[PDB]
């Protein structure tokens, strides 16, 4: 659930998922169109695509479990949806980590109209 994806992001990036990745670029937090502005935005785009593959699950509210084995995120057995959801988040978090170096503040609170273009998953 959103509580876990959040905590996952913090451990990983030391950034509060709430400011930092809730209104970044075109796909971070809401968002449903245009061209990702950068890596981090690409990450969100993929994450959003990842959820797209689970039509009958509920990402934002279904909770799951995960442990860390030396920092390695490990999704634990739960429901089919929960496992799959946990995997999708896991990826996003790593993605975020991997692009911290390009995180740009100018992409926080990005205006909607600047998100032009089309992109398929």
């Amino acid at each position: 659930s959103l509580l876990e994806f959040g905590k996952m992001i913090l451990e990983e990036t030391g950034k509060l998922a709430i400011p930092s990745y809730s209104s970044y670029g075109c796909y971070c937090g809401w968002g449903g169109k245009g061209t990702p502005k950068d890596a981090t935005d690409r990450c969100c785009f993929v994450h959003d695509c990842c959820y797209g593959n689970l039509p009958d699950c509920n990402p934002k509210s279904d909770r799951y479990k995960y442990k860390r084995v030396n920092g390695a995120i490990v999704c634990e057995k739960g429901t089919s949806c929960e496992n799959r959801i946990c995997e999708c988040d896991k990826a996003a978090a790593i993605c975020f980590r991997q692009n911290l170096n390009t995180y740009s503040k100018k992409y926080m609170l990005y205006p909607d109209f600047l998100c032009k273009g089309e992109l398929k998953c």
């Binding site: 809730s22 971070c28 959003d48």
Partner: peptide, 4 residues
């Protein structure tokens, strides 16, 4: 609230 929410994350991505």
């Amino acid at each position: 609230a929410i994350a991505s």
